[PDB]
Amino acid sequence: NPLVYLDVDANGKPLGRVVLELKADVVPKTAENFRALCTGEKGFGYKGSTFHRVIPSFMCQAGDFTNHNGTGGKSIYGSRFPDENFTLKHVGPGVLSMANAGPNTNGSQFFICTIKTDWLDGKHVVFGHVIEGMDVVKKIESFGSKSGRTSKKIVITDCGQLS
Numbered sequence: 001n002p003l004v005y006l007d008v009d010a011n012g013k014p015l016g017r018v019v020l021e022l023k024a025d026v027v028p029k030t031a032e033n034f035r036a037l038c039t040g041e042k043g044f045g046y047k048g049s050t051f052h053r054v055i056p057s058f059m060c061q062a063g064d065f066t067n068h069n070g071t072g073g074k075s076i077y078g079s080r081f082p083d084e085n086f087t088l089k090h091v092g093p094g095v096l097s098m099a100n101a102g103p104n105t106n107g108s109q110f111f112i113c114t115i116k117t118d119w120l121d122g123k124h125v126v127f128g129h130v131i132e133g134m135d136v137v138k139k140i141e142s143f144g145s146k147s148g149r150t151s152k153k154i155v156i157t158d159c160g161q162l163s
């Protein structure tokens, strides 16, 4: 399974590195989309974009590198792509899952859970997990709010593939 990283800052101050294992063994098309958007190998991707919606005791959401507000994004497949499967469940903090706007509307937006979000099972495609840097995710969460608006600008300063 691929390992990728997000290096995250808040108002320019580094928070540290999140390492994510992508479950290509279960959701290969979804994992590949995220992997490629982390490396930037297609000329676009997550580098420089933000965590735009962060809600404590829920999740941290990112990946809208076109509109920076939860309305945008773009997949590597030329169109919104189908839900690959709903095998993996939102079991707890650190789960990596695809944001969407309903069935078969996967693009680039994603979220990292900070709690078991079981009510999203069967609605959002889970495709990875945090293996290092859950404390960084908790710091991101620390800058969220009930509305999800962040109290600092949370930026993916760098991202890429490790293995």
Ligand SMILES: NCCOCCNC(=O)[C@@H]1CCNC(=O)/C=C/C(=O)N2CCC[C@](Cc3ccccc3)(C2)C(=O)N[C@@H](Cc2ccc(-c3ccc(C#CC(=O)O)cc3)cc2)C(=O)NCc2ccccc2CC(=O)N1
Binding pocket: 053, 058, 059, 061, 069, 070, 071, 072, 073, 074, 075, 076, 077, 078, 079, 080, 081, 098, 099, 100, 101, 105, 106, 107, 108, 109, 110, 111, 119, 120, 124
């Ligand atoms: N137990 C029930 C109570 O539980 C309490 C906890 N709260 C929850 O469980 C809440 C309760 C319900 N409130 C919300 O849904 C929050 C919504 C929200 O904030 N909007 C702010 C951002 C825009 C909106 C509406 C919208 C506007 C324009 C276009 C689409 C939607 C709304 C929104 O919906 N944008 C989505 C994220 C999204 C993701 C992908 C695309 C997309 C995909 C592909 C391409 C391409 C291509 C190509 O060409 O390749 C382009 C774009 C567009 C939008 C959103 O954010 N989805 C919400 C979400 C996200 C992640 C995880 C979970 C949830 C559910 C949740 O948050 N659920």
